[PDB]
Design a binder for this molecule. Structure first.
Ligand SMILES: Cc1ncc(C[n+]2csc(CCO)c2C)c(N)n1
Ligand SMILES: *[C@@H]1O[C@H](CO)[C@@H](O)[C@H](O)[C@H]1NC(C)=O
Lengths: 374, 128
């Protein structure tokens, strides 16, 4: 009874997340296809994505439970096909701002993806269901990265054709969302629900901040003329680590009633220690290994957080809880990015940035490590 | 505001050598990719050279390659360009530019749409 919704949802996730053109977005926009200068891309186009994402995260989490999750998944599919038909056939800055608006709509609707399944599956299959859907997305992303790299390098394929392949993938993903079965008809009071949400908000803010400066750190540590290939390979390998880590959460048999905190504390230290390893160490290989541990360790916890939050929800407010925690994550990221990186703030270089990122995650582990009063 | 002033242009016999300098000020020089452009008398500005912010990559125009070597000095916030075996077609006014975004090379920004904030130019007249 739990097989059909899981299968179709995981097919939709895999096909939607498999987009080869993602790693080659900046080269595509500034390349000979559009010629959007670096200043334009970095100042008038990309920032629009954050604000559209933040604004559209409000209706999504306010109205994803009332209208059942399917409607939102279908809207996400339609938004995907327009982000990419406008990236394929869009020229100008205004058109790219509109594409960033539609991509903010796309990414703000992902709450319905992770909230839908618990509304159609029995509670006893919340553990297995949680792992599969998270893993299929990471496996899809790594597959897309590898395919794009091989095609560009070993076959000489222009970025336009990577965009065409991603468009086909997202269209095939949308074609599946029309078959998902339709479900049938202040919750933070619980400590377990609330405290897994506190990690979600703060930890997710730090994660998305690191991802934008890992590669710059590698350039600073080991300046090389072939760093581009090594940069891509490590990113794809790091994601595959998350896929196996998230998949193992829903496969290995363990009692999560008493191991809920222990995993949070134990694996919250690993995320701080790994970041301290990237910044401090001079070896570039150990810096590659630190990134794997950091990404895979985090993807392990986001699977338990979603599984454990949904277990303790008395009401069927899955999109509300998931959508408020991802909204506050953007709030922390946006405010904390201005303080640290933006010239208006501190203007820290990449050399010392990861001591703040590693120290930021150290506090998060500190709060949970200190939850012992005797 | 980023200011760039070039220094080194002049009149040199054919086959002599020159070493242009461009002392940048107003930005963290140790993050921005720098480049040299020229504007020959009768054409538009063209790319001549660029050196990544790490200093490990040096892209050159197909014409200059084998005679020009771009150099940078993050200690003095200065960028240089050694011209050797100057041919009569090297006549131009050389401008030094800076990437509009700090880590242009790392993010794979196209080089031909990355440099702005031009300088004031310096006349190089290589005569036969
Ligand atoms: C349509 C679209 N796709 C992905 C991102 C996320 N993102 C932020 S920065 C950056 C540059 C790296 O190539 C990318 C891809 C976006 N903002 N707009
Ligand atoms: C980018 O620049 C090249 C060279 O000028 C030009 O051929 C190409 O059409 C441009 N692409 C667009 C349409 O921005």
């Amino acid at each position: 009874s739990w097989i059909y919704p899981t299968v179709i949802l995981c097919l939709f996730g895999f096909f939607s997340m498999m987009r080869p053109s993602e790693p080659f977005l900046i080269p595509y926009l500034s390349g000979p296809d559009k010629n959007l200068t670096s200043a334009e891309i970095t100042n008038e186009i990309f920032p629009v994505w954050t604000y559209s994402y933040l604004v559209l995260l409000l209706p999504v989490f306010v109205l994803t439970d009332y209208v059942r999750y399917k409607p939102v998944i279908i809207l996400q599919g339609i938004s995907f096909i327009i982000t990419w038909l406008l990236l394929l056939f869009g020229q100008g800055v205004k058109t790219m701002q509109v594409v960033e608006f539609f991509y903010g709509m796309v990414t703000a609707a992902e709450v319905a993806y992770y909230a839908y399944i618990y509304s159609v599956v029995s509670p006893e299959h919340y553990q297995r269901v949680s792992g599969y859907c998270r893993s299929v997305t990471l496996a899809a992303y790594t597959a897309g990265s590898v395919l794009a790299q091989l095609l560009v390098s070993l076959a000489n394929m222009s970025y336009f054709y990577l965009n065409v392949i991603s468009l086909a993938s997202v269209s095939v993903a949308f074609l599946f969302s029309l078959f998902l079965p339709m479900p049938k008809k202040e919750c933070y009071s619980s400590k377990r629900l609330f405290y897994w949400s506190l990690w979600w908000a703060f930890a997710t803010a730090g994660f998305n901040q690191v991802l934008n400066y890992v590669q710059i750190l590698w350039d600073y540590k080991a300046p090389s003329q072939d760093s581009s290939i090594y940069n891509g390979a490590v990113e794809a390998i790091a994601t595959f680590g998350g896929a196996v880590a998230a998949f193992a959460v829903g496969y290995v048999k363990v009692n999560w009633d008493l191991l809920g905190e222990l995993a949070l504390v134990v694996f919250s230290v690993v995320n701080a220690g790994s970041l301290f390893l990237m910044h401090y160490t001079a070896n570039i290989w150990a810096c590659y290994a630190g990134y794997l541990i950091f990404k895979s360790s985090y993807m392990l916890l986001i699977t338990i957080a979603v599984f454990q939050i949904a277990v303790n929800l008395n009401v069927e407010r899955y999109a509300l809880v998931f959508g408020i925690n991802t909204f506050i994550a953007l709030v922390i990221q946006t405010i904390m990015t201005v303080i640290v990186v933006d010239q208006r703030g501190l203007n820290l270089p990449v050399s010392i940035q990861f001591l703040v990122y590693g120290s930021y995650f150290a506090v998060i582990a500190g709060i949970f490590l200190m939850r012992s009063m005797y | 505001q980023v200011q760039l002033v070039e220094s080194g242009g002049g009149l040199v016999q054919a086959g002599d050598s020159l070493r242009l300098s461009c002392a940048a000020s107003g930005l963290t020089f140790s993050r921005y990719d720098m480049a040299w452009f020229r504007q020959a008398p009768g054409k538009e500005r063209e790319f001549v050279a660029a050196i990544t912010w790490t200093g490990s990559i040096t892209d050159y125009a197909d014409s200059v390659k084998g005679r020009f070597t771009i150099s940078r000095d993050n200690a003095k916030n200065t960028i240089y360009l050694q011209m050797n075996s100057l041919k009569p077609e090297d006549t131009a006014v050389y401008y030094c530019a800076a990437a509009q975004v700090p880590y242009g090379s790392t993010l794979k920004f196209n080089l031909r749409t990355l440099f702005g904030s031009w300088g004031q130019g310096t006349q190089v007249t290589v005569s036969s």
